Structures are given as C-alpha cells and as structure tokens.
Ligand binder design. Structure first.
Ligand SMILES: *C(=O)C[C@@H](NC(=O)Oc1ccccc1)c1ccccc1
Length: 174
C-alpha cells in the first residue's frame, strides 16, 4: 500500500486541485507558481509548489496514476528518501526549463512523472537485481503518453525531467 511520500503527494495534489475549483486556477497560481516577478524571487516554496497544481481532471488523474504506480514502486523497493530526491530535483529542473522558454505560468507533476519513468526504466535495464523495472506493457503505455504530449495531441521541460531520472538511475546502477 502506497508509502508516506507517495501518499502525502497525492493528497497534496488533491487538496490543491480542490482549491483551484473553489478559487479559480489564477488565484491559486498567484500563491504557488514559480516566481513570476522579481519581488517574489525569495519565496522559496515556489521553486517546487508549481508541481502541485493541475488544470484539468485528466491532468491530475493520469499524473496521479503514474505517480502512484511508479513513485509507489520506488518508495516501496528503494525507500522514501530516494522518491523525495528524484521528486525535488525533477521538479526544480523541469520548472526551470519550463519558465525559461515559456514563462512562469505552468503546473503539474508531468516533469516528475517523466523522471520516475526514466528512472524505473533505466534502473531495470541496467540492474534487474534492484527488483525494480518498467514492465513491457508499461513501456508501451508510457510511450504512448510521451508521443501524445510530444506532438501535443512543453517538451523541453519533460526532456529535463526525463534526464534527471535517467541520470539518477545511471548513478544508482554503478
Ligand atoms: C504532463 O505531462 C501532463 C500529462 N501527464 C502525462 O503526460 O503523464 C505522463 C505519462 C507518461 C510519461 C510521461 C508523463 C497529461 C497529458 C494529457 C492528459 C493528462 C495528463
């Protein structure tokens, strides 16, 4: 059953999403978005809290499904600490890449899910004994979600998320 980091993140994303229905997306973005003005640059939660916001039912639902599954597997087999660090680094780097190319109005766990996906996949490719791997069906299901977002059926920030994941799996599998 989903560990504490996996659990607290899902609930935090649920709570934030409730606040966005109640107050509108814009007002929530006003408090949680990546610093959108120099006057806000020292509000440090904002470098991470952007990940907690979602803008549609499908967004939060598919994101939490992958988080629950991949994040849950990571937390279970490799520990909460590992999940926390992957999440912090991918959230920072994807948010940074996103704001650089498209400005600070964005949100969601996509960057983080791309990290977990790259992590779980490469970890199993190079080190099965870890007990963690991305199952064939899921390599497929995941790839169809890559293609979707890729052709918009931003990409740069998802690439950034993925690199974090691949980098950590590479490190862990030495
Ligand atoms: C973020 O990319 C929003 C996106 N969520 C999603 O793509 O998650 C995944 C799944 C597999 C690999 C990487 C990322 C999304 C798009 C459309 C509808 C809901 C969510």
């Amino acid at each position: 059953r989903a560990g504490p980091v996996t659990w607290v993140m899902m609930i935090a994303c649920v709570v934030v999403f409730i606040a966005m229905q109640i107050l509108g997306d814009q007002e929530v973005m006003l408090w949680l978005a990546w610093p959108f003005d120099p006057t806000l640059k020292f509000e440090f939660w904002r470098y991470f809290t952007h990940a907690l916001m979602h803008f549609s039912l499908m967004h939060i639902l598919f994101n939490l499904l992958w988080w629950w599954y991949l994040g849950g597997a990571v937390e279970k087999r490799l520990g909460s600490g590992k999940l926390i660090v992957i999440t912090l680094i991918s959230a920072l780097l994807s948010g940074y890449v996103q704001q650089k190319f498209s400005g600070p109005w964005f949100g969601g766990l996509s960057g983080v899910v791309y990290a977990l996906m790259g992590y779980v996949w490469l970890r199993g490719e190079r080190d099965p004994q870890s007990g963690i791997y991305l199952q064939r069906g899921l390599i497929i299901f995941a790839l169809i979600w890559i293609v979707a977002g890729w052709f918009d059926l931003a990409n740069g920030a998802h690439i950034a998320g993925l690199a974090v994941g691949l980098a950590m799996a590479f490190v862990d599998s030495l």
